[PDB]
Amino acid sequence: APVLEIYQDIANLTSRMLAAANASNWDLVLNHGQEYVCLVERLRELEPGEPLDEAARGMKFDLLVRILENDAAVRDLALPQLARLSDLL
């Protein structure tokens, strides 16, 4: 199904964001957010419904766990550096 295509793309994009965050390329991470918002809008046009196939349910669930884990991992790379540097100024 096609809505599975957008979850995949968001997972791929969030993995790219993670790679940038890993390299401390904050501006790239932000630049990836532009696509991210596009992808969420497109997601929003397909969803919700109609129900999903059991096979395609566990796949989306996985994709989500991955998107959320990526989102958490970006924050967990960036924020300790932000906190630290903020403390200084």
Next chain:
Amino acid sequence: PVLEIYQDIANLTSRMLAAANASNWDLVLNHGQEYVCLVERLRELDEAARGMKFDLLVRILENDAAVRDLALPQLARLSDLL
């Protein structure tokens, strides 16, 4: 159901957005423990229910992005100084 989890992750992300707005990065970071725990608790539906879940998801997705959009330009410009 699994809506509970989704609800809890959405709510938490709202508290993180509120903290972010206030520049309390430590507090954003402390809730991040709670998020991850809820996310891993996930690794583990009628139409009204799927509309509900989908709504929560969009909110979580928007919230993560809203926090990055606050946090990262500050970080970009502070690493550059230092």
